Paper text:
We determined the crystal structures of AF9-YEATS complexed with the K5/K8- (1.95 Å resolution) and K8/K12- (2.00 Å resolution) diacetylated H4 peptides. The crystal forms of AF9-YEATS in complex with K5/K8- and K8/K12-diacetylated peptides both belonged to the space group P1, and each asymmetric unit contained two AF9-YEATS molecules (molecules A and B). Molecule A in complex with the H4K5ac/K8ac peptide (chain A) and molecules A and B in complex with two H4K8ac/K12ac peptides (chains A and B) recognized H4K8ac at the aromatic cage. The positively charged R61 and R64 residues of molecule B hydrogen bonded with chain A in both complexes. The electron density of H4K5ac was detected in the H4K5ac/K8ac peptide complex structure, but the position of the side chain of unmodified H4K5 in the H4K8ac/K12ac peptide complex could not be determined because of low electron density. K5ac and K12ac were located outside the aromatic cage; Nε of H4K5ac hydrogen bonded with E57 (left) and the added acetyl group of H4K12ac hydrogen bonded with D103 via a water molecule (right). The added acetyl group of H4K12ac interacted hydrophobically with H116 of AF9. The interaction modes of AF9-YEATS with H4K8ac and with H3K9ac were the same: the aromatic cage of AF9-YEATS hydrophobically interacted with the aromatic residues F28, H56, F59, Y78, and F81; and the amide and the carbonyl oxygen of the Kac side chain formed hydrogen bonds with the hydroxyl group of S58 and the backbone amide of Y78. The AF9-YEATS domain primarily recognized H4K8ac regardless of acetylation at K5 or K12. Therefore, the mode of primary binding to K8ac and secondary binding to K5ac or K12ac by the AF9-YEATS domain provides a unique molecular basis for sensing the hyperacetylation of H4 in the nucleus.
Acetylated lysine (Kac) in the N-terminal tail of H3 or H4 provides a binding scaffold for reader proteins such as those containing a bromodomain or Yaf9, ENL, AF9, Taf14, and Sas5 (YEATS) domain. Another Kac-binding domain, the YEATS domain, consists of approximately 130 residues and forms an antiparallel β-sheet structure that can recognize and bind Kac and some acylated lysines. In humans, four YEATS domains are present in four different proteins (AF9, ENL, YEATS2, and GAS41). Human YEATS domains bind to the acetylated N-terminal tail of histone H3; however, their Kac-binding preferences at the level of the nucleosome are unknown.
Residue numbers in the entry:
A (entry chain A): 1 to 138
B (entry chain C): 5 to 14
Write the structure that this text describes.
């Protein structure tokens, strides 16, 4: 009751996108990759249960699930979109997960490729002992 | 509908 605790964890969301030399048979012009990771020398898997990447409905199996690192999707397409990302926690109490609406933008042909990084800080106020242990390992 | 787009914009 004397002591209080705030634990902060750093997530990095990002994507790369490059125009293909030749478009696919379906007419997909771009190759892209989206990811969620920790900083260098981090182990976010200690507290991350899974990452869910909600692709545009035009993709087959659009709710892409990554239970183990790396948390990323590699795809080909013709356009960018808002891509909701859910990071689930190895946590018994709330919050169970966090959601980000990720802007998976693609540049036009004749323009340089995309290499974007978006930093996200999470704060857990007075987590459970077990979750605190998990968070601080990352 | 018509969510998929090219360029950053904004």
């Amino acid at each position: 009751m004397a002591s209080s605790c705030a634990v902060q964890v750093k997530l990095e969301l990002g994507h790369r996108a490059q125009v293909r030399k030749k478009p696919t048979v379906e007419g997909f012009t771009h190759d892209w990759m989206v990811f969620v990771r920790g900083p260098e020398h981090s182990n976010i898997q200690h507290f991350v249960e899974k990452v869910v990447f909600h692709l545009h409905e035009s993709f087959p199996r659009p709710k892409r699930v990554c239970k183990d690192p790396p948390y990323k999707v590699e795809e080909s397409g013709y356009a960018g979109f808002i891509l909701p990302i859910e990071v689930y926690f190895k946590n018994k109490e709330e919050p169970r997960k966090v959601r980000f609406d990720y802007d998976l933008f693609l540049h036009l042909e004749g323009h340089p490729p995309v290499n974007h990084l978006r930093c996200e800080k999470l704060t857990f106020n007075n987590p459970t002992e077990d979750f605190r242990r998990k968070l601080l390992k990352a | 509908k018509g969510g998929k787009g090219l360029g950053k914009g904004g």
